[PDB]
Design a protein around this ligand. Sequence first.
Ligand SMILES: Nc1ncnc2c1ncn2[C@@H]1O[C@H](COP(=O)(O)OP(=O)(O)O)[C@@H](O)[C@H]1O
Ligand SMILES: Nc1ncnc2c1ncn2[C@@H]1O[C@H](COP(=O)(O)OP(=O)(O)O)[C@@H](O)[C@H]1O
Ligand SMILES: Nc1ccn([C@@H]2C[C@@H](O)[C@H](CO)O2)c(=O)n1
Ligand SMILES: Nc1ccn([C@@H]2C[C@@H](O)[C@H](CO)O2)c(=O)n1
Lengths: 242, 219
Amino acid sequence: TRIKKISIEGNIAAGKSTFVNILKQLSEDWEVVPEPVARWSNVQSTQDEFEELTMSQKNGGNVLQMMYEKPERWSFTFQTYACLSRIRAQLASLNGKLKDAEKPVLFFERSVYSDRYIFASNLYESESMNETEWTIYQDWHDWMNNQFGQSLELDGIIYLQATPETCLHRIYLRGRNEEQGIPLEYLEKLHYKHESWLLHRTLKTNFDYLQEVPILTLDVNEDFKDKYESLVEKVKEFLSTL
Amino acid sequence: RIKKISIEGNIAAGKSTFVNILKQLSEDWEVVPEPVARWSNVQSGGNVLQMMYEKPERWSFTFQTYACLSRIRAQLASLNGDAEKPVLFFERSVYSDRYIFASNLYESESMNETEWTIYQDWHDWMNNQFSLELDGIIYLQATPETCLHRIYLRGRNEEQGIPLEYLEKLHYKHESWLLHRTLKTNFDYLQEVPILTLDVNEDFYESLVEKVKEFLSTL
Ligand SMILES: Nc1ncnc2c1ncn2[C@@H]1O[C@H](COP(=O)(O)OP(=O)(O)O)[C@@H](O)[C@H]1O
Ligand SMILES: Nc1ncnc2c1ncn2[C@@H]1O[C@H](COP(=O)(O)OP(=O)(O)O)[C@@H](O)[C@H]1O
Ligand SMILES: Nc1ccn([C@@H]2C[C@@H](O)[C@H](CO)O2)c(=O)n1
Ligand SMILES: Nc1ccn([C@@H]2C[C@@H](O)[C@H](CO)O2)c(=O)n1
């Protein structure tokens, strides 16, 4: 409970990775849990202790690609594993980083809440998950959180706000293969969910504390150098209020 | 302190019937049933059991994840909620979920390589967190023909189309895991858990119940 937990939220290619990985260098007390995107593009489970000595860990399926190619078939599968992989990364880093730090802060790239309330919810609303899939999913997520929830509770949220058009541009800059067919319209739906959750705060979750969690909203539409100074100043001022 | 004993066996071998009888021998003895009701009426209603049998290539992964999720939830709940020698009997376990049912689906191509890899990762992680380790297993052994008859007897709508060949496959995995002990899991302690095998092919027992009473005293 000593470690402050801050989630960085924003649409696909808003610049969360870029920002927080540059941000964390400012303090030895600051670390980041990246999102497990690579685990989704190359799906692998653990090898047997003898088998790994003679067999390579091969590249597996790309469930990320599967979800984008056929959302109505693969959404449930993808969202389940996205959330599983995140909880795993976040719980291990909480248990193992920043043991001694004076004022330790762990920044999470997204959270289990955006997994459910933004991404999966948007899939359900789009009829990419039917009623049964959506029910199973929330049942699972609810249960995981009653177990592995207290430890993962956020002290604050930093919302990196970029327009859908900026995000689409940045998807192209970044060049991640599975995202190259994403339409403006999809990013726009994701944009609206983040705005409802983080800016207007009209989106109600099953997690009551989140109605109160402090939120810092940052505009990241400009080129990185143009606003970075003010952004840093704002983050520092925000962290000192938690 | 609670002793945990899993009852294993093919579909309709008689596990619910057997453990419901067994339970009455002692107030120190409780059961955790397989949450089948929750599978045929998916609530927070869809029938994911039926979906799995009707369209296995579409719904197998989804069913297995929920089956195992609902099992873990129920077992952890019973553990947490003044008995001299407490015994908890689980109808099936997280191991049979993965190594008998989910594995059979993958072998039948009802789950693809990606689905199976995700399932296994999820199961590995879910059980590394979780207390549920067994002190013994009771294997109720019935032939696939006995099991098919008992499916019909019971009359669960979702199950009525199951062919003998599907039950034969499940039978072979059971015998490999529990009789021959040739099925390997990534769960080391399981190779040492004692197993009581009980033949339940005949019409129902008194004796079989007594045999358990005593197996437990060796644990
Ligand atoms: N402020 C910015 N100005 C110009 N490019 C940016 C900026 N922020 C991020 N980028 C670029 O946008 C792409 C997406 O950034 P990334 O951090 O990977 O986003 P996220 O982690 O939100 O998906 C990357 O190619 C990165 O170089
Ligand atoms: N030994 C037995 N002899 C005759 N009927 C049995 C016997 N064991 C179970 N049954 C009946 O067989 C059907 C399946 O039993 P059940 O306990 O629901 O199986 P399981 O829990 O293994 O799926 C039920 O209708 C039950 O009454
Ligand atoms: N639960 C989540 C989290 C992230 N995403 C997408 C998949 C990728 O294209 C990016 C990765 O940040 O976002 C997603 O679709 N669902
Ligand atoms: N993990 C599991 C556990 C049980 N089953 C089947 C489904 C029903 O027909 C019966 C219920 O015992 O077993 C199953 O298919 N997968």
